[PDB]
A = this chain, B = another copy of it.
């Protein structure tokens, strides 16, 4: 599909059998989701944003369906304002900016 930016680029993602709303974020290198339980081990990761750094937990090889497109990759869980789909997952579903 082609998504214009007159409103927030929100999509519903399916993770762990449940639906969530996430924002397509080209300015985010990584995908960060709000607090939730994911399987396996996690390793630490410091990520910088607009207001500074935060420490999040990194989970690798996580199945996540974005707008019907299946992706398997790294997901970071931490105190984020909203679920953010970053470039690591945008490239997997073949997302590009055009103008």
Interface positions of A (Cβ within 8 A of B): 1-6, 8-9, 23-29, 32, 47-54, 67, 69, 80-81, 84, 87, 90-91, 93-99
Contacts and interface: CB of A to CB of B under 8 A. Distances in A.
A2 B54 CA distance: 32
Given A23-B27, A69-B99, A91 B50 contact: no
Nearest to A67: B99
Nearest to A32: B50
Nearest to A25: B27
Contact of A5 (B3, B4, B23, B96): B96
Contacts of A53: 51
Contacts of A47: 50
A9 B97 CA distance: 8
A65 to B, nearest CB: 13
Given A5-B90, A25-B25, A48-B50, A97 B96 contact: yes
A38 B37 CA distance: 46
